[PDB]
Every structure is written in structure tokens, then in C-alpha cells.
Amino acid sequence: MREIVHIQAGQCGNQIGAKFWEVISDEHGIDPTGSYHGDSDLQLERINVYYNEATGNKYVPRAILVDLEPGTMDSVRSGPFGQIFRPDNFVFGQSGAGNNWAKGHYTEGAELVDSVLDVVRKESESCDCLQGFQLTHSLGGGTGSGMGTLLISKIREEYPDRIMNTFSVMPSPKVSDTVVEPYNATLSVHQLVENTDETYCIDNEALYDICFRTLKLTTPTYGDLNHLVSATMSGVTTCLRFPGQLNADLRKLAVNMVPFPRLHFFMPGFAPLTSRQQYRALTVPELTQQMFDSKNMMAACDPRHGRYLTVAAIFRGRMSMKEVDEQMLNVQNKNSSYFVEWIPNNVKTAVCDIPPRGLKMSATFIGNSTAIQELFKRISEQFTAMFRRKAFLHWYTGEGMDEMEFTEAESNMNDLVSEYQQYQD
Amino acid sequence: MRECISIHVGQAGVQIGNACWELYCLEHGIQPDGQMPSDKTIGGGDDSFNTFFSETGAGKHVPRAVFVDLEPTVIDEVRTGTYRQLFHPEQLITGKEDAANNYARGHYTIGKEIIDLVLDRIRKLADQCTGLQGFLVFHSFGGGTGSGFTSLLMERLSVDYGKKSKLEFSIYPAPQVSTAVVEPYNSILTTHTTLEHSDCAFMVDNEAIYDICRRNLDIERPTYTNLNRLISQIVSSITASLRFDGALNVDLTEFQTNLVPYPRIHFPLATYAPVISAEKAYHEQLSVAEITNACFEPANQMVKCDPRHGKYMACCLLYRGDVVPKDVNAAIATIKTKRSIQFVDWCPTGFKVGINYQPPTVVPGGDLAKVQRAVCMLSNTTAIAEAWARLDHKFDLMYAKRAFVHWYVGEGMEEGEFSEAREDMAALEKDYEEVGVD
Amino acid sequence: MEVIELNKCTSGQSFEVILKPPSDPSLEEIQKKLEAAEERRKYQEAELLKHLAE
Amino acid sequence: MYTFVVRDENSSVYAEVSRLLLATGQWKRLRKDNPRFNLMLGERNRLPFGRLGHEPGLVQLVNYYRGADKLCRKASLVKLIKTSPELSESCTWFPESYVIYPTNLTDEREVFLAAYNRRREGNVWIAKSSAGAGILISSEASELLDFIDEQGQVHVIQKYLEKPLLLEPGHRKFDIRSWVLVDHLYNIYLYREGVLRTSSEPYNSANFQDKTCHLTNHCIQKEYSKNYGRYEEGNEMFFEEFNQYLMDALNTTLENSILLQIKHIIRSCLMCIEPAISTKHLHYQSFQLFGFDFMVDEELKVWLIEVNGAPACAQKLYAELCQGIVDVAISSVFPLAPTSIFIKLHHHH
């Protein structure tokens, strides 16, 4: 009984977290009312990792929905699986965060964080043995970015030896709500560099390019972008949610994926990514070739620009595990210049019999790559382009912040870039 | 009669224990409920099998084993499995969260908080013994428990059972069945702290077990059940002398005497044959010479290496089945004239032979086929040092960058213990070379 | 090529052949090592909480 | 796309092989420490064989046979010939040799003097070691032993061929170098192209102090010999010329007078150690190029001098031979999407 406490904060966080519970709840046979109606015992094998069992054999997600305005969470409550969430686990305010990190982290957010931690503490007090936490949120907004990172700081204070995991959406000018997203993202990145063990970096620009090009959709919605995040999350949590040959466990994953404490920002990806010529069967070679291709990665970074420190790959469905080993070894033994040679056997592979709903077989890619520095370089450049003129700073200095704090976040990330650089050579 | 307590640590050890005691029961005619019809002494007796089994007044024969794991998923299978009735609950010890493939976590953080409990359960089995020989410890190198908690247990066992002997069955890390990048760290950390506490260690390299399963058993992708059932065969061939009437390797002290003239070089190389697929139409049964000659083929060693380029410090031939001393020596002479058996000048160029007439027992529905005669060769060769080189080299690739070291420091381990452990393996490699090379 | 010490019983026999002739820490010290690491963990956690308090 | 690593920067041979491998556009080179490789052109000394054949999915191949040093060491070859029943101490094609340790250190000092005292009662011997360019030729036993004691490494004393076949005109000594390649299957291929490293100085049996007409090494003739390159270019005669000479002068062919014995000596040596170095049932595979050095006396009898484990090739035969290595040794295990230049020496495995 290794339970995970899930937390979703802000607009992006709750909308993405919503579909995430809409996806895996389907994979475990749980209906909108929490009742189980699957047909395989493997669905309930590790069901208590993400779900609490209530009276009447009901399964209630172990999730905490957090926001500073009620709008997004009201929708989820009226959404597809809105009924399934715990009524108490909704913690929200009324002032909102105005896409301001300072408001979510220092003023507005501070006024609400304690009541969230009271709910987190409540879910933990019932866990037999809590693995750790996972947080969904964006870094470009105010709540999930500013208050999300505040939550992580306070959760680490109360549970210092638990694993902190996050799915963090990175802002792109091409999928932008406001011009202050670089400011908010640079401030959160520093928090994440300190207080998380793993951070799956999802770049909205990659989600757009996949929807536009690979998927063939004309400038889609945040909803379209989110189905990719749903899939990605269901992928990287497969080895945790089902009985895999491996012990899974968040800490074991961290130990094998994180050779250095500050370099824990992963590039996710999966296959297939087919547009609607969709009923065609995909071979194990096709899954592997695409799974390592840049166009199937959510971080929007070219791996052929850096080196893989560690790689994880989960295959789903009844397939030839011999042909799986053959293909994985063929990707490595054909591009070994992109893997560091000072970490023996840094590419691990597991199989899961249960595939994504409506798919014969699939592949999820988890890469700890030094090419992620291209992402932090983009944010840093966008940040400095405005901070050099102190543009839009008054929104933040008006909430009690100081330019000094910005200058530190700036330097903290330029060092993070330097760190990723020394390990690429 | 003198008793032997087996300790199974971590997932690898516990699961391999499953395979051994399953086989031990089928060999000694013991049922899953612990009953033994052939046993005529009810609830007591000092027979050869009583070295591994106690007896209750209700005629039940209970293994003298302890299963320890920091996480309960593995041992829980035993609690509801076929042989759930053999063991009583005290023998199965489980924690709540494992060491996460982190030596420091199993030795220090978690190890400290449960070490005194395990010893308390071991003391219970010990108190049932009238003349305990020692302990057999099954564990893995790569696992955080198998490595970290084992070495702590070994140190304490040397403190509470000073005069007792301790043998190991260790699983060498193999990428083809591991998702752990840090196992080289764990293997070298645990070999450093365990060395002065183990009298004789039997290393099985998963790479070897993996290939034997694929080449001989035609298993495309082996499972832990395929691997462990084969591993328990070798283990059965090595422990058979302790559980049966005989004169060779009757107690654990005889294992160092006949296999380890130098204390630090206490890692014999095991070789086994034949391994025939049960799915095979029907194999031509091999003779004494053919199975004996195979003992000098790399494809059936528990550790892939080249004995032709080493020196033997000792050699034991364990036979099971239809084998008479005449045939053994007959094949030996034929091998001395074909192979290059180079001993060390300070060791006799001889060998000890043990023959048990009962042929190897096969698990119903298993992968191995029934054979009339088989052999397991224990040879203390400097060639096994190749496995140390391979491992030490991988340890060096990562440690030059301190990769993953923070996970160990974060559990309380000092960084210097790393280099101190590596310096010890460097000494071990030097010993092997001073004894083998000219 | 001599056979020596041939033992025979109902369940088998054993012999030896000579092809060619030849030519700890105390329970006190373990508790200290264990408590030493436990203290290093308490110190590292102390600095983390100190950091968080700042 | 096959991958290989290079761990011997001083190899002239495999430098051409690696050059050709890259030419095929189907072989990729890796850093000398990247363990994911299909082919290793490894170092000379302390090649880590123990680390080969343990990377899942890779069939690995190496250009050295572990254990060949027994046959490519001055003192090792002697011991192997005297102790291997296949060769016997009565081996008729290897000069009478003895292992002699310096007194500052088994040893065959007394056994040598017994045979020496018998001859004194042609008794010209030569001393050499593997730590030389340092060789001494003498007919007094006292000068040979005192020379070894002045050193610190193991040496070997063997009978000096006082009746070496001399080429005319010139009355000059010489030797023959044959390249032999053994592949993973242990097929012995003899390169069709040999070379005679001739002496540009007239052989003289009344003066062993001057070692320029006795030693036919390409470095000595091109450094201490003053007639270097007079008869044949670079003191290197090839089989075409040496074959025509044997016909005009001795009325016989290189095949029947010398090559049969060479092909026999190569077989007997390689077959002998096959059980100790074969990689048929090993986790990796091995091949290796060898340089056999022969002597020929006035009776057209062939003698084995030594076997080099990392030999060089004649400047004019690098392309032909190196390509031959890629064909039968490398591409035979890693095929690529004739009239062989080798002579297969069949044998019982």
C-alpha cells in the first residue's frame, strides 16, 4: 500500500489534472460515480495508489483541487468525472491571482495555503505508507505557479523525506495568455530546482506543434493540448498504477533517473501520435523509432542537441518483449553518441500488459536529457528581454517583492543552464 | 546432527529461497503442509535432513529459514503461496518501504531500525539447535536491501555467533534483468563490508542464468521463476551434502577447507550440467565424461569468464545420480590431457569428488528435464576476478562524476566510504593477480 | 593419480584424488557507526529546515 | 551501422583497416572508452579481455587472441616448443634453444653448457631477448652468459645458423616474413604475398662482432648497412623475384623448396595452442594477424626464428592485405550490404 497524494493548482493545473483522472479512472474501470465496472483484476491490483476506498466499494481519487478563483474548479465539478472527486478536497478563494506569481506565492496564496495543507495532512493521515506527492500546474500563471511552488515548499517542511513530483507546463510566446509568463516561470523554476525530485517538463509550444503538424489540427484549444498531457501522465504513471515486473515506487524511479540533485527535469514523450489511417497496426520498431523522435516529445527540445543522462521507456500491451529488447538495443547501439558513456546501462525498459484504452500497444518515453537546457535558455532570454527594462515589474513590486529577488532567480537559472552544459561535454 | 539456518534477504534472496525450499521439499518427500510420510521419527530425530528442517509434535517439518525484506510485497506471496504452511509467521519479516536500490538506505537509515528484530527471530531458530553450524545467506548485490541490510546483518552475526560459519549465495548484477543504474555502487559497497564476515561466497551472474535459460531451455524471455528454479538446482547440488548422508562437505566448515586456502579469495566458480529443455522431444542421455567435460565449458558457468587463463586453488566435483568413482577418474584423466588445468604451485593439483546416488529432482511442470546423472563443479579460479574487473570498472565510470552519490550521502553515508570500498576491491583484484599471473 | 579416503554409504560415496603434489568490530563499534550516520541525517535535515525557516 | 573503437594509435595495419572501414560508409567509429562497440582494434599490452562480451545485444569482435603471447614471446615460444608434445623437444624446424635467466634473479643454464661442451668437443650461438631493439653473436659460451647477466630481463640462447642460404650476387644473408591471419572460426589463412628482408652486406662467418651482414632487420640494414637498397628496393625482395631466382640458380620453385615447410610450420604452431585460445564456445570472438619469421639454410631447409604478435606490413602490400582483413576477419562477422589473397591451411579442429 504505497499511496500517492495528488494536487492540482490553478486553471491549467485543474483542467489538466481533471482529464488525468478522466483517463486513468477509465483505465481502472472506475465510472464517474466512483463505482468499479472493469473486467480485469489487474485494474484493482494497485488501485489504492491513486484512489481511496470508501464505503460501498466506492473508489474516491486521492486528489486535492486548489485555486484562488472558483471558475475553473466549478467547471471540473460539473465536468465529466466531476462527481467522483471528494467534496471537501476543493479548496478555493475568490480574489484570484491575476497571472501574478507574487500574489500566488506571497499575498493571496499565503492567505489560503494553510487550509490546503490541512487537507493534504488529512489524506496523509489515512495513508498506510505514503510514497510522495504529485502536483499538476503551469509555471506561467499566478496560482499553480506562485502558489503551487509555495505549497511544495510547505509540504517539504512537513514531509521532508517524501518524494515530491510535479507535471509542470512551461509557457511559450506562441501559446501565451500574458506577457508576464517568463517572469512567473523563472521564479517557479528556482523553487522546483530546490524542492522537487522529478519534474516532467511539458512545453505548450511542443503540444501545439504536435497538434498542428503531427496531428493535423488548425490552432487547437487548450482542451486539445490537454489530451496530450492526459496521455503523457497516464504513460509515466503506468509502472506505478499496474503490476509491473519492477517495483516502481517514486523513490526508486528518482534514484535511477537523477544522477545529480538539481538535474531532475525530464523530457516526456509517447507513441503513437496518429491523425484521423488510424486503424493501422503499429509495429514494435515503429513504436521505438517514433518514441525517440523529437516530434513525439513534450518538452520541445531537440535531444540531438544534448545527451541522455538516463532514459526510461514503458511499453503497453501484449507484444513481443524479445522484439522490444531488440529494438531498444537497436536505438542505443545506433546513436550511442547521444548517451553519456559514464553511466553504464542508463536505458531501462519495462512492459505493461494493459494498453491505453483503444490501443493495441503504445510506448511512453521519459528522458533525463541535458538538451532540456534549451528550454531554460528560452525562458531566461524572454525573462531578461523585459527585466533589462524593468517592464511589467510594478505588478510584482506592488505585492511586496523587490528587484533583487528577480535578479537572483535570473542568476539561479543561468547557473542551472551552466550545470546542464558541463555534463554535456 | 548439526543445524543450518538459511537467511533470505531482499527480493532476490526471498524469491530464490522460494525455489530452493520448493526443491528441498520435493527431494526429501516433504509436502506443502510440512508432513513427511517417509520420516519414521514423529516430531524429532537427528537425520541428515534435520539440518534444514525442524519437526513439531504434529509431524510437521519446518524449514530453518528466515525471510527478511524491507518491503512486504515479496514475502506476502510466501504467506499465501503453495508452501504457506511450511513456515510460521515469525520466520517472515517485512518492513513497509524498501531501500529504493540505495545501499546506504538499507544498511543505515532503514537497517538500523530493524536489525535488532531480525536477530531476535534468528536467535529463536538458533535456540532450537543443539549444534548450529552456521548460516546460508541469500541476497542480491544490486538491491538496496540485498546489499545494504545484508552487510549489516553479517557484521552483527559475527558478533553474536562468533565461532559460526557464514556462506553466501550472491546474485551478480546483470543489465539484462535489472532497471537499476546504481547496482555497481551497491555491489562494491556490500562486498567491501561483507568480505571479512563471509567464509565462502557463491556468485551467480544473472547474465549466465539468462543465457543458459535461452540457449538450453529455449526460453525466449526468461522470468524470475525460470531463473530461480535453475538457480535452486545449483543451490541444491551445493547444499546436498549437508542434507544427505555422506562424507564430503558434511558441515559448513568443510567448504572453506576444501575451497578457500586464502581468506579474501573465497569466491568459488560454480559450473553445472546438464541443462536440458523439458519441451525437447527426448534427449540422448549424457555420460559421466560428457557431463564432466562440460564442466570446463564457459556456457555452463554461473559466472561468464575464462578459466583457461587462471589458476586453480581447489576443486570439488559434486555428482548426483548414476555415477561410480571409476567413471569419474576415467573422464578426469581424459580432461587433464585435453584441457589446460594450471594450479598454483602452493596447492596440490588434486580434487575432491562427492557422489550422491539420488539423481537431481525436477519440479513438476518446470523447465528442466529429468536426467540420470549430473554434476556441479566448484573450482576456486583466479579467472572469476574478471567479474570483479567488469564491476569495478563500471563503478569507476560513474564515481569519476560522483553520479548518484548524493542519494547515498543523503541517507547518512559518508562519501569517503565509497573510495574506501573501491580501494578494497582494488586490493582484491591485486590478490587474484599475485596468485594467478606469473 | 591416486584415489584416497574412499567413503561409501547407502546414499553415495566420496573420494579424493591427487593428480600432482604441491610445490572484527564489536557491537559497540557497530552501534557508533550506525548512530554516526543517523546524526549526519539529523544535521542535513536540520540545515534544510533552517533553510525553509529563512 | 556497425561501430568500432580504436585503442592502439601506433598500429600501421589497422590504421588502414579503420580507414577502409570508414570508407564503406557502414562502419562508425566511437570514443576509445565507449563500451557499445562491435569491433575493438585493441591495445598491445594489458588488453582487458574480461570486459568483452557483456553488453546485451552486441556481438563483439577483437583483433587479438587472448593467450597468443605464449607464441609471440622469445622465452615463451621456447618453453612452448619444449613442453608441448605436439611440437616435442625434438622439433626439427626450430633451432636448439634454451631459457637463460640472469644471475640477478625454470632456468636452463646447466643444460645449455652440456650441449655447448658437446659441440666444442660448428658451435656459434646467438643471444637475444624481447626487450631489445640488443643482440650478441659469439662462439664462446663465456661471452654469451656474461652478456645476459649484464642485463635484467629474461633472454634466450639458440644455435646460430652458420650455413645460411646466400643470395647471388652479393653472398648476402636474409630472412622471410609471412603474414598469417586467423579468424573467429580458427581458419588459418596465409597471405599469398611474403617478403624477404635481405642483407645488403656480404655474409662473413669469420667475424660475428659486426652484426650488419648477420642481422637482416629492416632497421639495422637501413641504419648500420652502407649498401642499403642496392640490389632490391629497401632491402625487400618479394616472392615474384625470389621465386625466379630459385629457378635460375637452384632449378626449383619457392613453393616446393620453402613454402611447403612454412605452411607446415604455421599449421603445427597454431593448431598446437588452439585448445587454449579458441573462442568457438566463448562469449566474444577473436581474430589476429601474425608475422612469422623464417630462416633458410644452404640445404633449403626452413627454420622458425620467432613469431610477432603485432607485426607490420610491407609498404607495397598494405592496401591488398588490410582489405583482406576486412573481408575474411571483419565482414565475415559483420557483413556489408576474388580470387582470395589467402591460402587456407585446412586442419582438424
Ligand SMILES: Nc1nc2c(ncn2[C@@H]2O[C@H](COP(=O)(O)OP(=O)(O)OP(=O)(O)O)[C@@H](O)[C@H]2O)c(=O)[nH]1
Ligand atoms: N536471479 C535472480 N535475481 C533477482 C531476482 N530478483 C531480483 N534479482 C536481481 O536483484 C537485483 C535487484 O535487487 P533486489 O533483490 O530486487 O533489491 P532488494 O534486495 O529487494 O532491495 P530494495 O532496493 O529495497 O528493493 C537486480 O539486479 C535483479 O536482477 C530473482 O528472483 N532471481
Ligand SMILES: Nc1ncnc2c1ncn2[C@@H]1O[C@H](COP(=O)(O)OP(=O)(O)CP(=O)(O)O)[C@@H](O)[C@H]1O
Ligand atoms: N638462430 C639464428 N640463426 C641465424 N640467424 C638468426 C638466428 N636468430 C636470429 N637471427 C638473425 O636475427 C634476425 C631476427 O632477429 P629477431 O627477429 O630475433 O629480433 P626481433 O624480434 O627484434 C626482429 P622482428 O621485427 O622480426 O621481431 C634475422 O634476420 C636473423 O638473420
Ligand SMILES: Nc1nc2c(ncn2[C@@H]2O[C@H](COP(=O)(O)OP(=O)(O)O)[C@@H](O)[C@H]2O)c(=O)[nH]1
Ligand atoms: N497545456 C495547457 N496549458 C494551459 C492551460 N491553461 C493555461 N495554460 C498555460 O498556463 C499559463 C497560464 O497559467 P494559468 O492556468 O492561468 O495559471 P493560474 O494562474 O494558476 O490559473 C499560460 O502559459 C497558459 O498557456 C491548459 O488547459 N492546458
Ligand SMILES: CNc1ccccc1S(C)(=O)=O
Ligand atoms: C491553445 N491555443 C492558444 C492558447 C493561448 C494563446 C494562443 C493560442 S494559439 C496557439 O491558438 O495561438
Ligand SMILES: CNc1ccccc1S(C)(=O)=O
Ligand atoms: C496515446 N497514448 C496514450 C493515450 C491515452 C492514455 C495513455 C497513453 S500512453 C502514453 O500510456 O500510451
Ligand SMILES: CNc1ccccc1S(C)(=O)=O
Ligand atoms: C518509469 N520508470 C521505469 C519504467 C520502466 C522501467 C524502469 C523504470 S525505473 C522505475 O527503474 O526508472
Ligand SMILES: [Ca+2]
Ligand atoms: Ca485579502
Ligand SMILES: [Ca+2]
Ligand atoms: Ca523425524
Ligand SMILES: [Ca+2]
Ligand atoms: Ca568472522
Ligand SMILES: [Mg+2]
Ligand atoms: Mg488563466
Ligand SMILES: [Mg+2]
Ligand atoms: Mg525490494
Ligand SMILES: [Mg+2]
Ligand atoms: Mg619481434
